[PDB]
Design a binder for this molecule. Sequence first.
Ligand SMILES: CC(=O)N[C@H]1[C@@H](Oc2ccc([N+](=O)[O-])cc2)O[C@H](CO)[C@H](O)[C@@H]1O[C@@H]1O[C@H](CO)[C@H](O)[C@H](O)[C@H]1O
Ligand SMILES: CC(=O)N[C@H]1[C@@H](Oc2ccc([N+](=O)[O-])cc2)O[C@H](CO)[C@H](O)[C@@H]1O[C@@H]1O[C@H](CO)[C@H](O)[C@H](O)[C@H]1O
Lengths: 158, 158
Amino acid sequence: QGVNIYNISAGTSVDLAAPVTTGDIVTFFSSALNLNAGAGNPNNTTLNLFAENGAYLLHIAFRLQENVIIFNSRQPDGPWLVEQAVSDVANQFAGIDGKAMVTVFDHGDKYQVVINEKTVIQYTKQISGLTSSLSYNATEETSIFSTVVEAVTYTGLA
Amino acid sequence: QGVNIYNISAGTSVDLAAPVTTGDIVTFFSSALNLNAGAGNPNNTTLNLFAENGAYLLHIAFRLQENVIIFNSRQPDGPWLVEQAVSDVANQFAGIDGKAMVTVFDHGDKYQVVINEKTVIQYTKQISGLTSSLSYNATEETSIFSTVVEAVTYTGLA
Ligand SMILES: CC(=O)N[C@H]1[C@@H](Oc2ccc([N+](=O)[O-])cc2)O[C@H](CO)[C@H](O)[C@@H]1O[C@@H]1O[C@H](CO)[C@H](O)[C@H](O)[C@H]1O
Ligand SMILES: CC(=O)N[C@H]1[C@@H](Oc2ccc([N+](=O)[O-])cc2)O[C@H](CO)[C@H](O)[C@@H]1O[C@@H]1O[C@H](CO)[C@H](O)[C@H](O)[C@H]1O
């Protein structure tokens, strides 16, 4: 078992030293929380788990203006697949201010997403595979998280 | 599976909403790092996993003056057991400044301790059982970590 730490500036991605597979965990840590950020176009912030081939295994989109969190997947150079949506952004974060954490458990055929201590969705995968890189995209203006998001992975758990 | 967050002021402990058992994980996060803190008496900082009966399942002691990290266990109202020691404190933290994280994996008959990304010890348990509370002890003067340490547990993984 191992712990890997990464620092992700908004708009960039990182390649993992250890891939995330079934039974593994990834937690994104934000040193800030701005639920009053400007409107998204349409996203304020997105967090993503990528396959080495470029596929979007899991796409987490926070949209304040639409007050919802979208979950989707997408083949390397393909169209976005079936969107799953959880309504009420601020409710998922309630209980903790000025910071936040987003955790994704890889349960084989589903991705469990947890905001702080709250389970937000049991996302049935539309695309399977090993997560080889992670990303955090947003503008320095309308992101709900800090400029740099810390990612910690817990691998080789199974 | 669930995520639980706790904030631990130095010298206090917290009771877990979800106990940590075999296959589970606990990570202590410090917002500071002072490897130049005053001498310990003999500990500068200790992090602990407790059983509900008060037993010290795992005791992690950081001693700058002795430049070593001690690992031990202790029955509720019993003597300290066999000490395990890893030498060179600062080396375990090398690579990251101003902050740190300490992770403990409960592997059934052993506790794996990881400082940041470095595995420090594969502690063979001297006392088994469920971890029901965690603590972070130190003086506001000679602690190597921040005044408040954030603890995150990942339970129900097995
Ligand atoms: C701008 C916007 O709200 N895009 C949404 C919208 O789809 C469109 C596409 C084009 C236009 N337009 O030319 O005016 C408007 C809306 O709804 C889609 C779902 O039906 C998407 O939500 C789309 O945003 C895209 O969502 C995907 C994830 O599904 C991903 O987050 C993309 O980055 C995002 O643009
Ligand atoms: C002060 C000190 O260095 N204590 C150490 C030492 O044991 C003693 C006990 C008493 C005296 N004394 O009356 O002068 C000096 C030293 O070595 C022990 C191991 O052989 C311990 O390391 C002890 O510290 C205690 O360690 C345990 C864990 O084993 C725990 O961290 C206690 O909080 C700590 O005091």
